[PDB]
Paper text:
In eukaryotes p97, also known as valosin-containing protein (VCP), or Cdc48 in S. Cerevisiae, is one of the most conserved and abundant AAA (ATPases associated with a variety of cellular activities) family member. In fact, p97/Cdc48 acts as an unfoldase that couples the extraction of proteins from membranes and complexes to ATP hydrolysis. p97/Cdc48 is classified as type II AAA ATPase, as each protomer contains two consecutive ATPase modules and assembles to a homohexamer with a two stacked rings architecture. The NTDs are essential for the recruitment of most cofactors, as well as for substrate binding, whereas the ATPase domains regulate ATP binding and hydrolysis, controlling cofactors binding and substrate processing.
We generated three mutants of the human p97: F266A (D1), F539A (D2) and the double mutant F266A F539A (D1 & D2). To structurally study the effects of the D1/D2 mutations on p97 we used single particle cryo-EM on both the single (F266A, D1) and the double (F266A F539A, D1-D2) mutated proteins and obtained 3D reconstitutions at 2.7 Å and 3.4 Å, respectively. Coordinates model shown from side (left), top (middle) and bottom (right) views of (A) p97 F266A at 2.7 Å resolution and (B) F266A F539A double mutant at 3.4 Å resolution. Overall, in both structures the D1 ring highly resembles the conformation of wild type p97 bound to ATPγS. The D2 rings aligned with the ADP conformation. (E) The D2 ring pore loop 1 (P545-N558) of p97 F266A and p97 F266A F539A double mutant also resemble the ADP state, as evident from the pore dimension and the interactions between neighboring subunits constituting the pore. Given that the proteins were purified in the absence of exogenous nucleotides and both mutants present poor ATP hydrolyzing capacity, while retaining the ability to bind ATP, we postulate that the obtained structures represent energetically stable conformations in the overexpressing bacteria. Addition of UN to wild type p97 sample resulted in a significant reduction in its ATPase activity, as was previously reported. p97 F266A had an intermediate ATPase activity, attributed to its D2 active ring, that was further elevated upon UN binding, suggesting that UN activates the ATPase activity of the D2 ring. (2) In accordance with the all-“up” conformation of the NTDs, the affinity toward UN of these mutants (F266A and F266A F539A) in the absence of ATP resembled that of the wild type p97 in the presence of ATPγS. Presumably, as the NTDs are already in the preferred UN binding conformation.
Author numbering:
A (entry chain A): 21 to 774
B (entry chain F): 270 to 774
C (entry chain B): 539 to 672
D (entry chain B): 270 to 403
Write the structure that this text describes.
């Protein structure tokens, strides 16, 4: 709300040299003409030059040369703050050096070329780091600042010598700085960027308060996640968005030198980060410098580990230094670094979801000349198991395909037509469809943690189940004051039981959606793989994973599978207990309802389940999920068929009226068979037409009466011919009697108080 | 500092040690502290190399040579004692030990008071509710939690003024405070460090949380209280004091409560070992952890060491039919070995608890071992009244409701059942309160009433019709064939004591 | 086409080496489109009795890894899996579920034309007479 | 050549690597070929010593630093991918793979034609029967 906080707008003149004003401001201000001016924007990036040729357009705005969109700033919506400061001294000469272009063709002097006539009445009032493309020719060619006789921004006088020693420099060498990567090159990690910014911006940006407050800052931050998820760029981004100076370290480089070079290098990094402050250090591949003490064979290894422990313990100086570092798992580094005063904060970066993949694709494809029929959102949904680097690869392959696909033969004839032909090249959806099949992703076995889309209307009945689940999961995330004011303790899990294919995973996903909560799934083969392998210590990792990501629904499907692998209930003589469910017990007894983790289990044989887990302070509730009734079948059929081209004559009300005792899985089967038939007929018609035409000596024929555009009723009728049930009525009777037993256990008449 | 000693060349390290011991001899009487001694001297095995074993030997030498009447004491810090070379744990070397351990709620309250004395709190902060809501936290975790609460309070509102660089920041900080909602947000955003550590403390459970079982109380008192307070009697009559007992009976009748209560009356520590811990030693062939449990109890005596679900390994392998193997197993055999190797001078009392007394190895019910058996039955009237009150003494209840009659119509109910009743009634009350709140504030949003302040708070209590709707779902978990089984496992052993009257001449 | 035979599965069973399934599936990934054929899929179920056998139910460490691997690949990469058995009654029913094999085709004993064509295919490398009529 | 890099003293080896990468930067656009890379860099476990892990780290460094728009490609040869340190199989390092595999009968016929073109064969040699018998 400061007086001179005004918006930035377009430019009217070509070069960066003349600045504008807004005269309604200078009454309270002291804006005069001269040499320099203090102008304030983002990241302390500035371009100080002459000012005051304005009043062409309306007030409460600051007009700024075109190049100042990435000079001094990033985009529009910023604000320019205004304070002159004239009367600067005179040094002999300053800032003369181009970078990319005029290296082409003739060399000359690179100041005597075309930049000759600019200084007239404007004898070089400018600042460092200034970049504006200018020429006496096309008026668009780079120019950079290198030399500093005095470093502050100075003034020029004639009869001087300059320094253009160095042949210009290009794009890659200064690319990270030129990119000035900010929080726009980073996709798929919005939450965790929020967390990091919250951690750091106060200690790094407002440090004098952080002094006057007394609270202690972070010492060590550890970033987790698989390879290819943008962790270095994060560090650069935070450093540049905070003004802070960054020092970057690389593990295998520290370990590629002699035992004395390595430790010197560490010490010097920590030193340089103490001198320049407030700083940031980044360590990549820390599992290289410091793995599990066991694996360490040698004496230089353990010794540089000890050096790093020492150097971490000695950062207590009120010196505004933060050390960030990157690994894959936390069980991959020596555990002595994970200690109060050392790396005590952690962030999991994880695999993206479809919105994140869409962000990454938008970020990459902004210099590609796409084509009109590309729905990158269909792609982002067709990229399961991909991390960001995998999508960079996929874009690359699509584009290079589009190139070699047609213009190979012209590409061969060496000439300059290549240039215009590239200026006429595009990328199609068939390119992405070919690349996407030619890909081998990297995180198909990683654990997926996300919010699901499944909603209550993909289900149609089971209304009291819905209400129950809501009382159990929704009310304590939203209304905990009630649970205090009545002093009640909230349940932490439940067990679903009933027959197969009646929709137990859908309900868990739906109640996770309503609370916008993460969902994790553990399946039967995972439990049997821990049994067969005597590896039941992986349960603890599952529960820790859910801890980080709370609030979460942690779902255990096929919980009765180890009991079936060893007979059923007769089986051995061993009773019900086993090593994997015993660890699940141990872990549920060791977590609090303060952290909001809800556990659902699911079974189809409730009679062979260890009864210890159905005890108080454990699952302790039982809900029956039956075979669907009419409305449920109608809604299930619609949910199945809401992506195929269907007719209108067909009525699913009657299909539901004649499908009683059918599991949803069956109805799904019906739909798949009907579409199977439609496909077969369409393909046959296409074959046999185009042939019958090839035979015909009709030199001309364009009449495509597209045979099959839909799915008609006789498809469905032929399908129902193969209709099948998978759930008998002796089974229904078994579940009904496992419900009524436990409903008679609740045998009490009416109880009226006196 | 260990890692500093190990971050130098093989000759710098030993010089450094020698010079410390020297400087502490010159200035006297002194004290040396060694932090992270597992770094300089771990288990001889792990040591791979020749500078390692060599600085270990240097430290052994330097300890043996402190005999000078020179007033030097060496203190040092580890996590476990099995983490250092055992040759340092020797007469003349490190021969005294202290366990510092995890705090309890009074300690956490002390730590919170100590930290928060320069924070500008706010009036509605009961740090004692916090200290009770911080299970598994050590002191550094509470420093962290305070920090997070305060920095939250800061960024919560004054971020936008914090941004406009000027000196108003200073006065605004001079006007900043911390609320209980800050601690409530931080406390949920915490991941504590000692949730798997063994808890050793005195419990609050007292005899009135229980209502009946008076002869059980008297018995337990004769067994635990009298020798802690009246050992002169036990000498003057030359009698030997029992060292343990076994509780048996049905589930949910209160066997852990009595053990906690008799630990309270003697103001003695309590330790609990549960069924999944024993099954984890079985499955894992790791039964050498029993010795650590018993040592733990040794340090902390006088103590009640409680073994729950002692019959669990016998059930995992069938019941009594099961295999052809008899009753013995590797984990209970180590418990035997350890009970036979401790004295009644150190005051450690062992209680076990089971619900299937028929499948328990009979070796452990022999003299010089548990050797007593007490029955814990289903509760009678007064017991149910007291159990209901103990359950409901934290919720806002009505006065019209009478729990006398609830107890009069609940016969054959385990305390666990009655607990279920109470939880369901509060469940219903909560549901109605939330619905009313929703639907009012909506019906008002619809109404074009630009002004309305009348909050007739709908549900402030727990009334009888809640309880009645709950009792509709009342359920028992203990049949009468089971009651008959326990009754016949009591009368058998009461007939074994079959003797008429025996009058001396 | 790739073929995996019965002694290979029994060699992973006897040897507790069932982590070689993943290499098979990766091999098929590189070479797609491919038919990956599993012959004698019921062999571990016969080595341990038939259906009476032990008290253990139908599950085993090698077919469980085959399940894990089929649930982790996409139809975008065009890998089709065929199995073959002669005792369909002792096969773990988890693998005949949706998103898995889930179709069953009967292959019977050959009829007339089938035998004629089979005889000719057998004899199309030997010097035969003309008088003989197949 | 791997075994040659490992047949020298710890300082000759790393100099040699650096000089190869240098010479391939000077002359460009170039190609480097590394044969028997399982010799320079096997599974981190098998590595016993300190010159071993150190030349592995040197090669990782030298791969990460090829970003110069310098038109250098590094090709290398192994038997299996589980035979090299997995840190080389990473974005920016060796990220593309090709399986060369065993030939089929058309390929064997090609190889035989390629070899036998300076042999003075005889009229009754059907190398295609051979290619099917190999």
């Amino acid at each position: 709300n400061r007086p001179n906080r005004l918006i930035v707008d377009e430019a009217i003149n070509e070069d960066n040299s003349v600045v504008s004003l807004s005269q309604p401001k200078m009454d309270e201000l002291q804006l005069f003409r001269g040499d320099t001016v203090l102008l304030k924007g983002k990241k302390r990036r500035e371009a100080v030059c002459i000012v005051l040729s304005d009043d062409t357009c309306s007030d409460e705005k600051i007009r700024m040369n075109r190049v100042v969109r990435n000079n001094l700033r990033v985009r529009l919506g910023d604000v320019i703050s205004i304070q002159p400061c004239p009367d600067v001294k005179y040094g002999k000469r300053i800032h003369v050096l181009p970078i990319d272009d005029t290296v082409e063709g003739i060399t000359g002097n690179l100041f005597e070329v075309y930049l000759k006539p600019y200084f007239l009445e404007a004898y070089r009032p400018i600042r460092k780091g200034d970049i504006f493309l200018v020429r006496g020719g096309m008026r668009a060619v780079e120019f950079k600042v290198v030399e500093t006789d005095p470093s502050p921004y100075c003034i020029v006088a004639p009869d001087t010598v300059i320094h253009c020693e160095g042949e210009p420099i290009k794009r890659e060498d200064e690319e990270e700085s030129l990119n000035e990567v900010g929080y726009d090159d980073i996709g798929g990690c919005r939450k965790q960027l929020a967390q990091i910014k919250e951690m750091v911006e106060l200690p790094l940006r407002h440090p004098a308060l952080f002094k006057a407050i007394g609270v202690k800052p972070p010492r060590g931050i550890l970033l987790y996640g698989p390879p290819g998820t943008g962790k270095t760029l994060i560090a650069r981004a935070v450093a540049n968005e905070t003004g802070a100076f960054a020092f970057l370290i690389n593990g295998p480089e520290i370990m590629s030198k002699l035992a004395g070079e390595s430790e010197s290098n560490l010490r010097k990094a920590f030193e340089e980060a103490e001198k320049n402050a407030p700083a940031i250090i980044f360590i990549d591949e820390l599992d290289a410098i410091a793995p599990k003490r066991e694996k360490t064979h040698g004496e230089v290894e353990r010794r540089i580990v000890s050096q790093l422990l020492t150097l971490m313990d000695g950062l207590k100086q009120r010196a505004h230094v933060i050390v960030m570092a990157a690994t894959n798992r936390p069980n991959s580094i020596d555990p002595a670094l994970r200690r109060f005063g050392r790396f005590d904060r952690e962030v999991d970066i994880g695999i993206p979801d479809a919105t994140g993949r869409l962000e990454i694709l938008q970020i990459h494809t902004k210099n590609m000349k796409l084509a009109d029929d590309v729905d990158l959102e269909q792609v982002a949904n067709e990229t399961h198991g991909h991390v960001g680097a995998d999508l960079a690869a996929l874009c690359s392959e699509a584009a290079l395909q589009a190139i070699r696909k047609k213009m190979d033969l012209i590409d061969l004839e060496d000439e300059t037509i290549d240039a215009e032909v590239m200026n006429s090249l595009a990328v199609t959806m068939d390119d992405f469809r070919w690349a996407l099949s030619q890909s081998n992703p990297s995180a198909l076995r990683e654990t997926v943690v996300e919010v699901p889309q499944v909603t209550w209307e993909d289900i149609g009945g089971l209304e009291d189940v819905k209400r129950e689940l809501q009382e159990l999961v929704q009310y304590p995330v939203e209304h905990p004051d009630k649970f205090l004011k009545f002093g009640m303790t909230p349940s932490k899990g439940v067990l679903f039981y009933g027959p197969p294919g009646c929709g137990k995973t859908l309900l868990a996903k739906a109640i996770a959606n309503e609370c916008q909560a993460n969902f994790i799934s553990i399946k039967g083969p995972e439990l049997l793989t821990m049994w067969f392998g005597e590896s039941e210590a992986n349960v603890r990792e599952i529960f820790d994973k859910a801890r980080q990501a709370a609030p979460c629904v942690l779902f255990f499907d096929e919980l009765d599978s180890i009991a079936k692998a060893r007979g059923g209930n007769i089986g051995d003589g061993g009773g019900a207990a086993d090593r994997v469910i015993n660890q699940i017990l141990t872990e549920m007894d060791g977590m609090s309802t303060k952290k909001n983790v809800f556990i659902i289990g699911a079974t189809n044989r409730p009679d062979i389940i260890d009864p210890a887990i159905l005890r108080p302070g454990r699952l302790d509730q039982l809900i029956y999920i039956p075979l669907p009734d009419e409305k449920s079948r109608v809604a299930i059929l619609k949910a199945n068929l809401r992506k195929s081209p269907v007719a209108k004559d067909v009525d699913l009300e009657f299909l539901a009226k004649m499908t009683n005792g059918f599991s949803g899985a069956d109805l799904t089967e019906i739909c798949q068979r009907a579409c199977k038939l439609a496909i077969r007929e369409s393909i046959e018609s296409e074959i046999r037409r185009e042939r019958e035409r090839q035979t015909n000596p009709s030199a001309m024929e364009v009449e495509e009466d597209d045979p099959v555009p839909e799915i008609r009723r006789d498809h469905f009728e032929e399908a129902m011919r193969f209709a099948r049930r998978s759930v008998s009525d002796n089974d229904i009777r078994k579940y009904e009697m496992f419900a009524q037993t436990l409903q008679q256990s609740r045998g009490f008449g009416s109880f009226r108080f006196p």
